[PDB]
Amino acid sequence: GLMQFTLPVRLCKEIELFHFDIGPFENMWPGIFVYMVHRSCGTSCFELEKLCRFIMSVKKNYRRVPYHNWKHAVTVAHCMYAILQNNHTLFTDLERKGLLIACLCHDLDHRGFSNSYLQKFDHPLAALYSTSTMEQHHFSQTVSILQLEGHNIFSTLSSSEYEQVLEIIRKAIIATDLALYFGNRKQLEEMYQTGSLNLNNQSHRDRVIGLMMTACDLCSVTKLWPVTKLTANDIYAEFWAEGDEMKKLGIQPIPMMDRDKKDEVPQGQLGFYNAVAIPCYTTLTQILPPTEPLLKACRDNLSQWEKVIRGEE
Numbered sequence: 001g002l003m004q005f006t007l008p009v010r011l012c013k014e015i016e017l018f019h020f021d022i023g024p025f026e027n028m029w030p031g032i033f034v035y036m037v038h039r040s041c042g043t044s045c046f047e048l049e050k051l052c053r054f055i056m057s058v059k060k061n062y063r064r065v066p067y068h069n070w071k072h073a074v075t076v077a078h079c080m081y082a083i084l085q086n087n088h089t090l091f092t093d094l095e096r097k098g099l100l101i102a103c104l105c106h107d108l109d110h111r112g113f114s115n116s117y118l119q120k121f122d123h124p125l126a127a128l129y130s131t132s133t134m135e136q137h138h139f140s141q142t143v144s145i146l147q148l149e150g151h152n153i154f155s156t157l158s159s160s161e162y163e164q165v166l167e168i169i170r171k172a173i174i175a176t177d178l179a180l181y182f183g184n185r186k187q188l189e190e191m192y193q194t195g196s197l198n199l200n201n202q203s204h205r206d207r208v209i210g211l212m213m214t215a216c217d218l219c220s221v222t223k224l225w226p227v228t229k230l231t232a233n234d235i236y237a238e239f240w241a242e243g244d245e246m247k248k249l250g251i252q253p254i255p256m257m258d259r260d261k262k263d264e265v266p267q268g269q270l271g272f273y274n275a276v277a278i279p280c281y282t283t284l285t286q287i288l289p290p291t292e293p294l295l296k297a298c299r300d301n302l303s304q305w306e307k308v309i310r311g312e313e
């Protein structure tokens with residue numbers, strides 16, 4: 001109870017900033033996550049023995065893939081921490097509880113293949129979940145781990161509070177399906193411009209949390225350029241492996257996943273920043289102004305990708 005998690009000074013200070021990188025020391029990430037729960041939610045909102053066991057079961061159920069791994073989990077959770085600490089009073093206790101866990105669990109048991117590749121492979125999961133295939137699976141994995149003996153970190157919540165947090169986590173994880181992101185941000189864009197946006201309206205809260213989830217999920221594009229650039233290699237390592245697997249199924253993959261179209265990557269990044277990331281953090285900044293540093297960082301990294309194309313690196 002009187003046991004506070006602490007971090008060395010440089011991390012103590014930098015972890016508060018949107019552009020924080022959690023570092024190459026795997027064994028520190030659990031500690032970094034508990035630190036963030038303790039500062040964001042309180043030291044009393046999870047029994048440490050149950051939280052510690054839950055975290056390590058979540059870690060065990062992430063695969064050793066190049067991008068969709070335990071490091072991605074904790075990175076996405078840190079960006080959510082930075083949003084929550086910069087927008088203190090907007091979020092309920094159950095939202096702070098739910099969303100950090102949502103983020104940590106949001107890619108549980110990812111194989112490093114898209115929903116598209118599962119459907120074309122005809123993977124069993126694609127018969128069980130026709131749309132948002134991996135995302136329904138990640139929610140299903142989250143519930144399984146919550147039901148392991150001694151893992152139920154929500155045990156001391158009322159029956160209704162418990163149902164509310166799992167509903168928050170499910171909507172949060174479903175929203176990381178980027179197919180759902182485009183429609184969600186359009187709706188939020190209209191709602192904000194027309195003045196109809198209302199955070200007392202639950203359906204509107206749900207939309208805002210969906211956007212926050214997209215923003216945290218995409219957060220490699222909001223880092224120092226060397227983090228962004230080197231994370232991009234991991235991202236493309238999964239994409240090219242999927243492109244390889246599409247070729248094995250007899251299907252020419254989209255250029256994004258073709259290791260033969262490596263030359264097209266800089267331009268594909270410009271597309272991605274202009275079509276997905278910049279609009280995401282723009283709308284998020286309008287709805288939550290203290291998240292402006294994510295938009296600024298994203299624009300700086302676009303400008304770095306423009307320099308790669310111009311041959312200035």
Ligand SMILES: Cn1ncc(C(=O)N2CCC2)c1C(=O)Nc1cc(-c2ccccn2)[nH]n1
Pocket residue numbers: 178218220221232235255256264265266267268269271272
């Ligand atoms: C940076 N980042 N973060 C997440 C993602 C992303 O889409 N994710 C995470 C899994 C789904 C990206 C990304 O690079 N997306 C791209 C690349 C190209 C692209 C298009 C044509 C040619 C080359 N590349 N189009 N979209």
Ligand SMILES: [Mg+2]
Pocket residue numbers: 106107134176177
């Ligand atoms: Mg995902």
Ligand SMILES: [Zn+2]
Pocket residue numbers: 072076106107176217
């Ligand atoms: Zn993710």
